[PDB]
Every structure is written in structure tokens, then in C-alpha cells.
């Protein structure tokens with residue numbers, strides 16, 4: 001309890017979830033797009049496109065009571081932030097480290113791609129950081145067929161171990177998606193949600209994602225499961 005997050009594009013779609021066991025929200029942007037009473041909004045520095053406004057964006061979100069900031073979104077993937085580990089280590093020290101006295105700082109969020117993507121990219125990043133990146137938690141993503149639940153638990157375990165190796169005590173799984181039809185998607189949530197709630201190495205997580213769990217303004221059967229399990 002208190003771990004479950006709302007990852008959104010349309011802030012209006014959050015209403016369907018009002019009353020459920022949610023503590024936090026993010027929107028892959030530096031600004032929320034509106035106001036949600038009773039939930040922590042966590043601003044994100046997505047990539048180099050956000051460098052210009054980030055100081056302003058980070059001051060605003062902390063003034064509104066966020067305790068956490070998130071760095072770049074899938075820098076290992078060419079259609080997302082598309083940064084080398086070297087460039088990301090230099091950017092993290094310039095734009096993330098300055099706010100450490102006033103917020104806990106999240107790593108760039110890697111995919112579950114095969115090394116040298118994914119957790120391979122995150123090794124590369126910690127190597128170039130070389131102890132000079134201030135990181136409170138690792139941010140990681142997993143997307144795959146609902147039948148590969150065992151691969152999803154191996155991936156989250158290996159992320160927890162990698163952080164501990166570099167004295168980062170927890171992970172946030174800021175996207176996961178057990179893919180398939182609605183029955184397969186609910187079966188995946190029925191397994192992983194209790195396992196993530198019991199896992200001491202996972203501080204926070206968000207299924208991917210609010211706008212796909214709502215039809216009109218009604219929860220799908222997947223959204224209903226994300227609310228009630």
C-alpha cells in the first residue's frame with residue numbers, strides 16, 4: 001500500500017481513479033497540466049528538449065510539495081531520449097545534482113531491452129557517473145507478453161541488485177505492461193501487484209498507463225483490476 005502510481009497524458013482521465021489506493025502521479029512532462037488534490041505530482045526532465053525551462057519547472061514542482069524528481073525517459077532507445085551513457089552522466093550532474101538538498105533524485109529510466117540497452121545502458125551510465133551522480137533511486141521499465149511474468153520478476157530483482165551494488169537502496173518501476181488481451185492483462189496484474197507490494201526493494205510503481213485503462217470515462221476491466229487488487 002502507498003506504492004501504486006498514476007502515469008497520464010490527459011489529466012482529466014485521473015477522475016475515474018479518484019478514491020483508489022494511489023499516492024503519486026507523473027505525465028512524462030515537467031509540469032502537471034492541472035491540479036489533483038491529495039496526490040504527489042513528480043516532475044520529469046524527459047531529455048535535452050527540456051534543458052531550457054528545467055530550473056523553473058523544478059522550482060515550481062518542489063514549491064507545490066513534491067519530494068522527488070525524475071531524470072531522462074528511455075535514453076537507451078532511439079525513438080525516446082536517445083542519449084549515450086557518457087552524455088547522460090554529464091547532463092545528470094548539470095540538471096539533477098543541483099536540486100539534491102531539496103528533493104530525492106531518480107535515475108534515467110531504462111527499457112527492458114537486451115544489454116547494451118536496458119540495464120546494460122544503466123551500467124554504462126553508473127560507470128561514467130563514477131560516483132559523481134547523486135541518485136536516491138533507480139527508475140526502470142518492463143514491457144512484454146503477459147506470459148513472461150518470470151522474466152518481469154527476474155528484471156525487477158536484477159535492477160534492485162544493481163542499485164544495491166552502487167548504494168542506491170530502492171527502485172521505482174515507472175512503467176510496466178503485461179501485454180495481451182484483457183483476460184491476459186488482468187491475470188498479469190493478479191500475479192505481479194501483490195508481489196510488488198510485498199517486495200521491500202520496490203518503493204513505487206505505475207502500470208502503463210492511465211489513458212489506456214479508461215474508455216470514455218469508465219475504467220476497463222484492466223483499470224478496475226489496477227484499482228481493486
Ligand SMILES: OC[C@H]1O[C@@H](O)[C@H](O)[C@@H](O)[C@@H]1O
Pocket residue numbers: 009027028073080209
Ligand atoms: O503515451 C505515453 C507517453 O509515452 C512515452 O513513451 C512518451 O515518452 C511520452 O512523451 C508519452 O506521453
